[PDB]
């Protein structure tokens with residue numbers, strides 16, 4: 001999940 005969100009940055 002971290003990756004899925006972190007892609008914003």
Ligand SMILES: *C(=O)c1ccc(-c2ccc(C(=O)OCC)cn2)nc1
Pocket residue numbers: 001002003004005
């Ligand atoms: C949420 O975005 C997310 C993405 C990817 C993973 C994840 C966990 C483990 C591996 C892996 O190859 O482990 C080898 C032991 C790959 N991707 N978790 C959460």
Ligand SMILES: *NNC(=O)c1ccc(-c2ccc(C(N)=O)cn2)nc1
Pocket residue numbers: 006007008009
């Ligand atoms: N929000 N985006 C990021 O923080 C981000 C981190 C890392 C990367 C990225 C891109 C390309 C490579 C590579 N060619 O190995 C590695 N990491 N993009 C975005």
Ligand SMILES: CC(C)c1ccccc1
Pocket residue numbers: 008009
């Ligand atoms: C620039 C756009 C894609 C954005 C990225 C992160 C946070 C807010 C907007």
Ligand SMILES: CC(C)c1ccccc1
Pocket residue numbers: 007008009
């Ligand atoms: C440089 C551009 C393609 C970008 C990369 C990662 C996150 C937001 C924009």
